């Protein structure tokens, strides 16, 4: 009656079409010229494809919105998806729901999703997209601005295309302390951040069973680190194998260090930075050396008394300053084949050396055959 | 208002707020209205996308724009956009598997080709020399790529890996040459050899190396310059004849180039080549800390 | 008047006309998917799981709905559903 007319009006205003451009589905109805079709049973409306000739009549309309007519067939659900004409179902993944059409969206805490798999799709209460098929072609597909924001925020850059081809995640290989929220002002204690940054590269346990265990850590993927601010730390940093450290330029008699590492421990009878050398214990196991004065001898390495875990380490322009009184700057122990360029230790704080930010002993090295220090300062 | 139809069906736009659906999202027309769109049109074939033409609108469009762009939609500090600072190339951009198992040859070759695509056959000396006057690009190798045919490095290429191998038991980053024909080189520079017709062909003979005389009488023309290597690790299947053919690389430079894997006690099954490196016609070349 | 409005609101949200309820003091909220405030002339999806027998107590201009079983800020729910 008038109900049909006022509804057509409601539907039309929603899609931006004309009242006459809306047709109700019914077996045998002429589909020609109409822009939108309304299923009175499900009470859902769908844009019709352009091209239905006059005289083409309706045969059937599935609950998944598949429309069959005298001239052929068409998935109104897929068409709706392509046109971003969606219905956001009540509830959520948490409440559970049942999906019947490709253009139905279910809300999750991080945005909306459509189901690209077999329909109907039942979602049990307490669900998540991961627990109900996962994401991707044939499963759950993220839809809408809210889910785009969360995806970009929690992603790895794979949504960002780059030239000549590929995506952003393909070319981001360098790490920074900023990824770990290091303050970088040389005041705040950035120790935990620096250690996590290194641990994420090569996390080697301080105690290990045998030689095969220790040696295994020299066989991992190497990663480059870029230090562009000033990081104050308070405990000896142990560089694991497979680490490349980089800084734009090297210090040269600089009064105020602005980029690099600042060692400021409570215990000054220690080293700022050390390579990893494992020492044999009575039980037969091995423990990372933490003793400041220790250095392995060739004998120690032959006795099995020591096992180095310092390989594939490269340094470019690292600047290291220390609080006055610190015993040792860098312990280059067991670093065979390891290399350095522009390693710069100590700060030219001022005229009085007793208060200058430099160590008593700059560098201590042993068991480092084939190592090269280029332009060390 | 999303108009009925699409770019496939064609349409006519009359208002600034009308959107026409394409396969990758919606667009409004920012030019002169009314705008007629013939059936079978695409935004690129009907004005292109930009101010005064087709303007991308909505979430679907933003997703595709971002996914197929170059980073120009992303602002960066202190100013400019992402594309302004992405200059390095990687095998991952070509979907290399990087596990040392899958054959990544085609991907690596494509990557090199996208930097400087040098034809294996050239008409003359002038043609060959031109390829040494192209923009150089840096490549970052962070995984392990197995390849099965000799890779020819064209001029204008810089290769880097975070660190260099050193008596490494198991190579984790770099190139692993695993060919069927082991009487070959893993990596080679480009040197062109004169043919009876006067044309030039890329050398692909493992034993060939140019001599000073060869260059002098035009029998050989180098196409190897502006090439720099920092920390490249190269291992090969046991029995591979030559690791690196550094031929004609005048002024070319290396640092931390590391050849061969310390696989185990039996050298017969070690993943290293019979001959590590063969070099000729490379005056002014420098190899720093070659392993 | 009311029926055509329910139609309008239902097509906007994609629900059935009978799944739209007008707010009034005491109205039973069970089973409805959308509620309409005749005063502000605004509609809001209802949180799922409101049992039959749960009646409306009050609806503020800030869209906070108080019913016999508790309360819900329909504005916050709308935000989570990107219904603006």
UniProtKB/TrEMBL annotation, chain B:
Domain Tail spike TSP1/Gp66 N-terminal: start-end pairs: 1-59
Cellular compartments annotated: Virion
Protein name: Tailspike protein
Gene: orf210
């Amino acid at each position: 009656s008038t109900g049909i007319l006022t509804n057509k009006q409601a539907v039309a205003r929603h899609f931006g079409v004309k009242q006459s451009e809306v047709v109700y589905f019914s077996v045998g109805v002429d589909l020609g010229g109409y822009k939108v079709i309304y299923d009175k049973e499900t009470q859902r409306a769908y844009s019709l494809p352009v091209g239905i000739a006059s005289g083409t009549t309706a045969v059937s309309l599935s609950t998944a919105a598949v429309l069959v007519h005298s001239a052929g067939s068409v998935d109104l659900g897929s068409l709706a998806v392509s046109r971003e004409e969606y219905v956001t179902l009540p509830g959520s993944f948490d409440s559970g729901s049942t999906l019947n059409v490709k253009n139905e969206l279910l809300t999750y805490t991080d945005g909306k999703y459509r189901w690209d798999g077999i329909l109907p799709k039942t979602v049990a209460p307490g669900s998540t997209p991961a627990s109900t098929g996962g994401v991707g072609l044939g499963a759950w597909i993220s839809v809408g601005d809210a889910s785009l924001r969360t995806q970009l925020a929690n992603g790895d850059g794979s949504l960002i295309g780059i030239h000549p081809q590929g995506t952003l995640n393909n070319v981001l290989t360098v790490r920074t302390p900023e990824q770990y929220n290091a303050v970088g002002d040389g005041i705040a204690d950035d120790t935990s951040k620096l250690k996590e940054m290194l641990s994420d590269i090569n996390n080697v346990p301080e105690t290990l069973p045998d030689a095969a265990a220790v040696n295994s850590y020299m066989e991992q993927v190497a990663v480059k680190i870029d230090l562009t601010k000033l990081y104050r730390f308070t405990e000896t940093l142990y560089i694991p194998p497979g680490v490349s450290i980089e800084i734009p330029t090297s210090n040269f008699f600089t009064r105020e260090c602005k980029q690099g590492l600042f060692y400021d421990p409570v215990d000054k009878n220690t080293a700022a930075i050390s390579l990893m050398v494992y020492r044999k214990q009575p039980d037969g196991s091995y423990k990372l050396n933490k003793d400041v004065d220790y250095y392995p001898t060739g004998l120690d390495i032959d006795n099995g008394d020591a096992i180095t875990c310092a390989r594939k380490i490269d340094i470019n322009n690292l600047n290291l300053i220390t609080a006055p009184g610190v015993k040792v700057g860098v312990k280059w122990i067991g670093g065979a084949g390891c290399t350095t360029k522009g390693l710069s230790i100590g700060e030219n704080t001022g005229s009085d050396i007793t208060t200058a930010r430099l160590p008593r002993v700059g560098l201590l090295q042993s068991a480092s055959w084939g190592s090269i220090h280029e332009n060390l300062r």
